[PDB]
Symmetry: D2
């Protein structure tokens, strides 16, 4: 078995086009620009009237301070995440205010599928080897089942739909550690709650790792929106994020 490392790639974000017949500007671009525009539209306060918050960064900080998170919802970011385990995405997709598109084992052949090594095993050659040996055996069963199910279903003339009927049964044997790939789209508020929830000590370590990497890259895009999240290291080497 080959192993797959976590890669999170930002592929989409908000293009803000400010409306001309409104008399306002701000030190920000894109999603953070839009969020300010939306909170200000709420009071038609286009003149920067509380000079404390006359910066995008200061305005956004204030919204987070008062708990008016709905304005955060206007801006969105998409990621393409590879090297994520099946079991990890099984936890991820419980978060219902995201949109998702995911590699499907019903359509995509998995005989060369890679595995994602749990973080608890990353530093142990014996454990990793046990895992990959077990994954190799599962892929061989998957190919043995695929071929026999294809024979069994030979009288289905749509070859495509046959393949699928076979594949979806044969994937029965693939382990949780099998690598998946997924596009995840979330608005700032959806992202904040996901990080709050999955970057805590309580969360499984794989999804914690993902959450923290998301925070890292989201903080690059909307520094003010995510500034209250604090990346600490724990007694056991792993990272957590908290507000």
């Amino acid at each position: 078995a080959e192993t797959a490392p976590l890669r999170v790639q930002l592929i989409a974000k908000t293009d803000f086009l400010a409306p001309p017949d409104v008399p306002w500007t701000t030190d920000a671009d894109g999603g953070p620009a839009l969020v300010e525009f939306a909170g200000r539209a709420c009071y038609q306060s286009w003149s920067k009237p509380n000079p404390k918050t006359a910066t995008n960064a200061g305005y956004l900080r204030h919204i987070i301070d008062v708990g008016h998170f709905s304005v955060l919802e206007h801006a969105s970011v998409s990621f393409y995440i590879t090297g994520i385990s099946r079991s990890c995405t099984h936890e991820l997709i419980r978060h219902r205010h995201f949109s998702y598109s995911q590699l499907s084992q019903r359509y995509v052949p998995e005989k060369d599928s890679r595995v994602v090594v749990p973080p608890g095993m990353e530093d142990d050659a014996d454990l990793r080897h046990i895992l990959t040996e077990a994954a190799d055996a599962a892929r061989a069963t998957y190919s043995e089942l695929l071929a026999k199910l294809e024979a069994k279903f030979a009288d289905q003339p749509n070859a495509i739909l046959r393949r699928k009927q076979a594949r979806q049964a044969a994937r029965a044997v693939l382990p949780n550690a099998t690598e998946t790939r997924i596009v995840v789209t979330g608005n700032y508020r959806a992202w904040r709650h996901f990080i709050a929830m999955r970057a805590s000590e309580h969360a499984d370590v794989e999804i914690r790792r993902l959450a923290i990497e998301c925070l890292r890259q989201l903080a690059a895009v909307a520094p003010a929106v995510f500034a209250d999240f604090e990346v600490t290291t724990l007694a056991d080497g792993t990272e957590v994020a908290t507000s």
Copy 2:
């Protein structure tokens, strides 16, 4: 490996208590009655002038026919589902207007988990034994890894954590076919969409058989809300449920 048959059990539904100061009654109770009530509340239409919508099934079929699906959201039904695979719940949970509570592999020991047999191999002792032996191996490996991770994490003084730390990693080798158990709650509208999506000929046969089973149980609770669905057989012996709506 022991195998697990799908079992869907209705564990909750709506209990409707008509407000007694609304000059209204109908030939039904529960979810179905709430739905007629909510619809009539939109138009304050308590007296029932049209005989075609004078009964509860008549009113509901009209609600469906005219697309007023919002009113269907007030009534719900809960199910406890067992003998469902992990891969199948992994499709189920993509539906975002349901509420879910699920057996966690982080908390529940899986040394002796049952396997769920893909419907396409249910009737074939050979394929089943290939899957069951591969699962037996995967659990054996699971157990090996667990003892080792518990050793590896022995310096974690909270034994509850420790086992959690071990289990959540050991489970890496557990297969898609591993049984899970889940409680799923949806309002009627959520269920209709679930049936439409996952009871079609394009869905995996496992989720599809779940869809059809929930449908048939929901149809017993609320015949008028689900009646537009027709269960129908395929070239290959499997079923679909579809609606012209």
Copy 3:
């Protein structure tokens, strides 16, 4: 001219049916029994070694304490709220994890529509008078508009269509304070977040007054789920509700 008092009628709640072959019982039924079952199903733990959590209330307490809110979603309550203003419902409906069925001004005559007096002027009869009379003027204008519209639209031979087309323009003049009526269904979690946002001090007094009323009826049927909330009186003399959770 006729003023509307807040009235809130519990019209629906959860009916629970424990599945037979699961060795667990509890000192509860309905919603709060469902929620315990949901939570236990996660750990497949049906026993009661701990007197803290050996009852429904203590178990529900604990689920709330650790913040496993998901389990609260399985159980629902529906109210029929009459005597709430249009502007108020316009705030209510921003809560997106509720389901709604509302009296439409497009279909229901508003000739004799009642108004809801803002609570910040309930006592001062002077201000009341300036409201009631401003509304009578708006009702008169709506009836004038409706008549002219119906007559303008006389060649729409479909009489229900004419009326709809006429009322939906005529209602332009009806004030914010006009009564509406509305069924609202939320799961225990939705309610908890509503009560928590709209029963605070920072919330408008009319919606606050709805929240606390919802709270007290939710406590009558699911006490442990909502026990952590406390109604206190503010400097104003108006009630608010809070919990440190």
Copy 4:
């Protein structure tokens, strides 16, 4: 009364950034490009075997025909909308898969608020005048209530609170036609749904106009995504937008 015309301005769309270690490219950018990527990521179908769907538009059209709407959810558009009534936005916020930031009446000066003329009376000077004169009246009655309400709360030292507390009761008398302004964000799936519901013959003409205008600006951004909707005209001379899906 000033009378505001509907105005819809596209203030946000999606910026797409192809990931360079994926062997794929397409004849498009932004939203439409993200959606294809999301669809192809599902099957890892990066090379493009079929010529019929080898273009961005051919691919998107095929996503719609097959009903895979999940994938439309990755891209969104935000609008700032003015010249929309309160009655209209009160219909609009029934849509729960949208994000809203609306001008508040508890906080913003309604002393000289503009009014929106219902489309049903737009072309009749007699009816418009009735509306705008009822409006003028109403804004007169609102001052009476405001200035007198601040006075009943002289005892409260917090000024900006005191103002808020007086408006919140004073807007009771403001009418449904009163202009509001709102930022509305949704993904392509959510837009399609709004258009299907509110561009229909059954919807109020004011929201219908809004929906057709949004349809127009969305169709420019992402033509393949909105191509199934045709705008036709009913016998009464009002527009509808319908799709066969």
